[PDB]
Design an enzyme around this catalytic site. Structure first.
Site, PDB file in Angstrom:
ATOM      1  N   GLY A 124     -29.477  13.935 -17.407  1.00  0.00           N
ATOM      2  CA  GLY A 124     -28.298  13.226 -17.859  1.00  0.00           C
ATOM      3  C   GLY A 124     -27.187  13.265 -16.830  1.00  0.00           C
TER       4      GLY A 124
ATOM      5  N   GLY B 217     -22.708  12.055 -16.444  1.00  0.00           N
ATOM      6  CA  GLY B 217     -21.510  11.440 -16.966  1.00  0.00           C
ATOM      7  C   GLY B 217     -20.299  11.980 -16.266  1.00  0.00           C
TER       8      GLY B 217
ATOM      9  N   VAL C 234     -26.817  17.007 -15.813  1.00  0.00           N
ATOM     10  CA  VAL C 234     -27.792  17.961 -16.316  1.00  0.00           C
ATOM     11  C   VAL C 234     -29.105  17.727 -15.657  1.00  0.00           C
ATOM     12  CG1 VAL C 234     -28.957  18.815 -18.333  1.00  0.00           C
ATOM     13  CG2 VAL C 234     -26.637  18.030 -18.508  1.00  0.00           C
TER      14      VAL C 234
ATOM     15  N   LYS D  84     -26.696  22.390 -16.559  1.00  0.00           N
ATOM     16  CA  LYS D  84     -25.565  21.505 -16.469  1.00  0.00           C
ATOM     17  C   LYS D  84     -24.619  22.027 -15.419  1.00  0.00           C
ATOM     18  CE  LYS D  84     -22.522  21.235 -19.890  1.00  0.00           C
ATOM     19  NZ  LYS D  84     -21.245  21.706 -19.312  1.00  0.00           N
TER      20      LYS D  84
ATOM     21  N   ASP E 210     -19.075  17.462 -32.502  1.00  0.00           N
ATOM     22  CA  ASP E 210     -19.735  16.303 -31.889  1.00  0.00           C
ATOM     23  C   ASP E 210     -21.206  16.252 -32.222  1.00  0.00           C
ATOM     24  OD1 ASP E 210     -19.449  13.894 -30.425  1.00  0.00           O
ATOM     25  OD2 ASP E 210     -19.654  14.919 -28.484  1.00  0.00           O
TER      26      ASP E 210
ATOM     27  N   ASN F  94     -27.027  14.999 -29.081  1.00  0.00           N
ATOM     28  CA  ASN F  94     -26.777  16.454 -29.013  1.00  0.00           C
ATOM     29  C   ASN F  94     -27.729  17.253 -29.877  1.00  0.00           C
ATOM     30  OD1 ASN F  94     -24.704  15.904 -27.248  1.00  0.00           O
ATOM     31  ND2 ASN F  94     -23.077  16.187 -28.780  1.00  0.00           N
TER      32      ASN F  94
ATOM     33  N   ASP G  94     -25.123  21.347 -27.274  1.00  0.00           N
ATOM     34  CA  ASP G  94     -23.862  20.820 -26.737  1.00  0.00           C
ATOM     35  C   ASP G  94     -22.642  21.346 -27.550  1.00  0.00           C
ATOM     36  OD1 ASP G  94     -21.843  19.564 -25.441  1.00  0.00           O
ATOM     37  OD2 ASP G  94     -22.979  17.706 -25.111  1.00  0.00           O
TER      38      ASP G  94
ATOM     39  N   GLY H 253     -19.695  22.041 -26.237  1.00  0.00           N
ATOM     40  CA  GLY H 253     -18.464  21.835 -25.456  1.00  0.00           C
ATOM     41  C   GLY H 253     -17.214  21.517 -26.262  1.00  0.00           C
TER      42      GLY H 253
HETATM   43  C1  LIG Z   1     -31.362  14.343 -21.984  1.00  0.00           C
HETATM   44  O1  LIG Z   1     -32.621  15.020 -21.881  1.00  0.00           O
HETATM   45  C2  LIG Z   1     -32.645  16.345 -22.185  1.00  0.00           C
HETATM   46  C3  LIG Z   1     -31.509  17.111 -22.381  1.00  0.00           C
HETATM   47  C4  LIG Z   1     -31.624  18.482 -22.743  1.00  0.00           C
HETATM   48  C5  LIG Z   1     -30.495  19.292 -22.973  1.00  0.00           C
HETATM   49  N1  LIG Z   1     -29.203  18.837 -22.756  1.00  0.00           N
HETATM   50  C6  LIG Z   1     -28.186  19.654 -22.250  1.00  0.00           C
HETATM   51  C7  LIG Z   1     -26.888  19.529 -22.751  1.00  0.00           C
HETATM   52  C8  LIG Z   1     -25.858  20.381 -22.376  1.00  0.00           C
HETATM   53 CL1  LIG Z   1     -24.297  20.149 -22.997  1.00  0.00          CL
HETATM   54  C9  LIG Z   1     -26.090  21.397 -21.470  1.00  0.00           C
HETATM   55  O2  LIG Z   1     -25.087  22.220 -21.080  1.00  0.00           O
HETATM   56  C10 LIG Z   1     -24.991  23.408 -21.916  1.00  0.00           C
HETATM   57  C11 LIG Z   1     -27.364  21.563 -20.946  1.00  0.00           C
HETATM   58 CL2  LIG Z   1     -27.684  22.773 -19.790  1.00  0.00          CL
HETATM   59  C12 LIG Z   1     -28.388  20.705 -21.325  1.00  0.00           C
HETATM   60  C13 LIG Z   1     -30.731  20.614 -23.404  1.00  0.00           C
HETATM   61  C14 LIG Z   1     -29.756  21.392 -23.785  1.00  0.00           C
HETATM   62  N2  LIG Z   1     -28.857  22.017 -24.115  1.00  0.00           N
HETATM   63  C15 LIG Z   1     -32.027  21.114 -23.519  1.00  0.00           C
HETATM   64  N3  LIG Z   1     -33.082  20.337 -23.274  1.00  0.00           N
HETATM   65  C16 LIG Z   1     -32.927  19.032 -22.922  1.00  0.00           C
HETATM   66  C17 LIG Z   1     -34.064  18.244 -22.714  1.00  0.00           C
HETATM   67  C18 LIG Z   1     -33.886  16.900 -22.368  1.00  0.00           C
HETATM   68  O3  LIG Z   1     -34.910  16.051 -22.199  1.00  0.00           O
HETATM   69  C19 LIG Z   1     -36.239  16.563 -22.282  1.00  0.00           C
HETATM   70  C20 LIG Z   1     -37.173  15.338 -22.246  1.00  0.00           C
HETATM   71  C21 LIG Z   1     -36.928  14.483 -20.992  1.00  0.00           C
HETATM   72  N4  LIG Z   1     -37.807  13.270 -20.845  1.00  0.00           N
HETATM   73  C22 LIG Z   1     -37.953  12.321 -21.985  1.00  0.00           C
HETATM   74  C23 LIG Z   1     -38.892  11.170 -21.545  1.00  0.00           C
HETATM   75  N5  LIG Z   1     -38.291  10.484 -20.369  1.00  0.00           N
HETATM   76  C24 LIG Z   1     -39.049   9.275 -19.934  1.00  0.00           C
HETATM   77  C25 LIG Z   1     -38.195  11.450 -19.277  1.00  0.00           C
HETATM   78  C26 LIG Z   1     -37.197  12.496 -19.738  1.00  0.00           C
END
Ligand SMILES: COc1cc2c(Nc3cc(Cl)c(OC)c(Cl)c3)c(C#N)cnc2cc1OCCCN1CCN(C)CC1
Length: 294
Positions: free
Chosen positions: A50, A52, A57, A72, A166, A171, A184, A186
């Site tokens: 991700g 923004g 991330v 992140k 949120d 999330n 999330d 935050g």
């Molecule tokens: C958007 O994807 C993912 C976000 C994730 C995630 N967000 C996050 C938010 C925040 Cl605010 C953070 O900061 C604390 C931190 Cl460090 C991480 C966390 C958490 N937490 C954990 N696990 C995640 C896994 C994810 O995707 C896994 C599948 C990917 N696959 C799907 C099929 N596609 C074709 C290829 C990509």
């Protein structure tokens, strides 16, 4: 902090409000005398999950244990002490939530060069991405599971006087076998924050109506989860504003989108979407319903 002597000053240091044996970081692959950051040296960066205004991330593999994680990284060095304190509060909020099976776990956090890094367990796709991939309304059997798990997470937060603020499909993260986790933190606040405020606002599409008047409470999250589940169960885009935004905050369930809901799921959503927060069901009360136990 903005009137304190904290300005215009200043390498990795652990971030932990709990307390630690050491703020020093070490890892296979990391030599502090090389110029690359701890993040660069200590992880294989696999993909960008991700991005923004906040930063990015990444999916990574840790050189310490060979396992996959999410990291992140904030976008640019801290603006100043208030920005730093706001960003570090996210780590505190994880530590206030602690370990719970329906909440994303924080593995570690650190700062270097004015940049904050948070390393979490790697989950499956966000609920938003899962629904994009599905390309249609989710089957209700999936929905009930995600509703239960996210309610379990909210009950955990709310019992401790924490409000997520949120809750939305982006999330919530899928796990194996039909489970999910809320992440999330935050925007999370501890009510009676000494005093009340300051606060940042969550996504307007999911915001509880009483937040317009500044009435912050755990109920707000129940509403946001109600709209999250309505969206995924009906494949219904939620308005950011205008007449439709108001209607969803006056008990309206659009017939063209919702007529295919089971009576049971519709009933539970009506409880969650009650406009008056004093009448809205609590997460504990919802989890006590027989439909949410099995
Ligand atoms: C958007 O994807 C993912 C976000 C994730 C995630 N967000 C996050 C938010 C925040 Cl605010 C953070 O900061 C604390 C931190 Cl460090 C991480 C966390 C958490 N937490 C954990 N696990 C995640 C896994 C994810 O995707 C896994 C599948 C990917 N696959 C799907 C099929 N596609 C074709 C290829 C990509």
């Amino acid at each position: 902090l903005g009137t304190e002597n904290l300005y215009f000053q200043s390498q990795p240091r652990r971030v932990s409000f709990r307390g630690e044996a050491s703020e020093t970081l070490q890892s296979p692959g990391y030599d502090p005398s090389r110029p690359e950051s701890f993040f660069q040296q200590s992880f294989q960066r696999l993909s960008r999950l991700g991005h923004g205004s906040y930063g990015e991330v990444f999916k990574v593999r840790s050189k310490e244990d060979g396992r996959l994680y999410a990291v992140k990284r904030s976008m640019s060095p801290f603006r100043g002490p208030k920005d730093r304190a706001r960003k570090l509060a996210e780590v505190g909020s994880h530590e206030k939530v602690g370990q719970h099976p329906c909440c994303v776990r924080l593995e570690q956090a650190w700062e270097e060069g004015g940049i904050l890094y948070l390393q979490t367990e790697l989950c499956g796709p966000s609920l938003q991405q899962h629904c994009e991939a599905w390309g249609a309304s989710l089957p209700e059997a999936q929905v009930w599971g995600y509703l239960r798990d996210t309610l379990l997470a909210l009950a955990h937060l709310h019992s401790q006087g924490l409000v997520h603020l949120d809750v939305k499909p982006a999330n919530i993260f899928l796990g194996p076998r039909g489970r999910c986790k809320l992440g999330d933190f935050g925007l999370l606040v501890e009510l009676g924050t000494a005093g009340a405020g300051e606060v940042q606002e969550g996504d307007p599409r999911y915001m509880a109506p009483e937040l317009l008047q500044g009435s912050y409470g755990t109920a707000a999250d129940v509403f946001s989860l109600g709209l999250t589940i309505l969206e995924v169960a009906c494949n219904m885009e939620l308005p950011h504003g205008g007449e439709g935004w108001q209607q969803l905050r006056q008990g309206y369930l659009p017939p063209e989108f919702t007529a295919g809901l089971s009576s049971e799921l519709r009933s539970v959503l009506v409880m969650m979407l009650e406009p008056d927060p004093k009448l809205r069901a609590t997460a504990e009360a919802l989890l006590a319903l027989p439909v949410l136990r099995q």
